[PDB]
Design a protein. Structure first.
Ligand SMILES: CC[C@H](C)[C@H](NC(=O)[C@H](C(C)C)[C@@H](O)[C@H](O)[C@H](CC1CCCCC1)NC(=O)[C@H](Cc1c[nH]c[nH+]1)NC(=O)COc1cccc2ccccc12)C(=O)NCc1ccccn1
Lengths: 99, 99
């Protein structure tokens, strides 16, 4: 699939059985999903963007299915207005930006 | 041509003469830059993201040349740590995210 940028490129993902809507963001190093339950093997981290810095919960190799394709990749939880899917998953899926 | 997400998709643009390193971001509704003196032709505004809000000077019809294409578009000025090229500029050059 092609992606028009006329609308926000929001697609729906299943984060390990848990369905969730995420934004394909090529200006994110990482992926931040709010309120999903991923467990116990976490490490707190802080992320940054334009208003400042947020505190997160880093989980590794979680399983993810999006655009009907599979992946295991780092997942950071936090207080984000939207679930962002950054470059770490975009590469995993083989996504690109074309002019 | 084409771009991978291995590395930040950062490009060299020229906003009315002045060259700058910009991030191609499908996750921004708007474009924001710093260290560029546009003029006393603006409207002020509050754009938000991770970490909260920031204030900007909004400037309509600015001319840009990036990746061999010339376009005219709104550009916001403010305290962004990295210059940003949002969806307003992506659709002006005919870029898309594909899989
Ligand atoms: C750390 C991971 C994280 C994803 C991070 N990057 C960013 O946040 C990107 C850059 C500033 C670097 C940023 O453009 C990004 O993609 C974010 C992510 C955003 C989170 C909120 C939900 C929607 C998406 N986009 C943005 O910040 C753009 C900026 C903008 C332009 N016009 C108006 N606003 N925001 C938007 O388009 C408006 O989004 C919103 C959508 C829905 C609700 C919202 C509620 C409140 C605020 C925003 C909402 C990064 O890698 N940063 C590297 C870095 C940071 C600091 C210092 C050095 N390096």
């Amino acid at each position: 699939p092609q992606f028009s940028l006329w609308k926000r490129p929001v697609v729906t993902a299943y984060i390990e059985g848990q369905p969730v809507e995420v934004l394909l963001d090529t200006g994110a190093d990482d992926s931040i999903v709010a309120g999903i339950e991923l467990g116990n093997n976490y490490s707190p981290k802080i992320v940054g963007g334009i208003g400042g810095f947020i505190n997160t919960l880093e989980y590794k190799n979680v399983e993810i299915e999006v655009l009907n394709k599979k992946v295991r990749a780092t997942i950071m939880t936090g207080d984000t207005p939207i679930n962002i899917f950054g470059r770490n998953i975009l590469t995993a899926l083989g996504m690109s930006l074309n002019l």
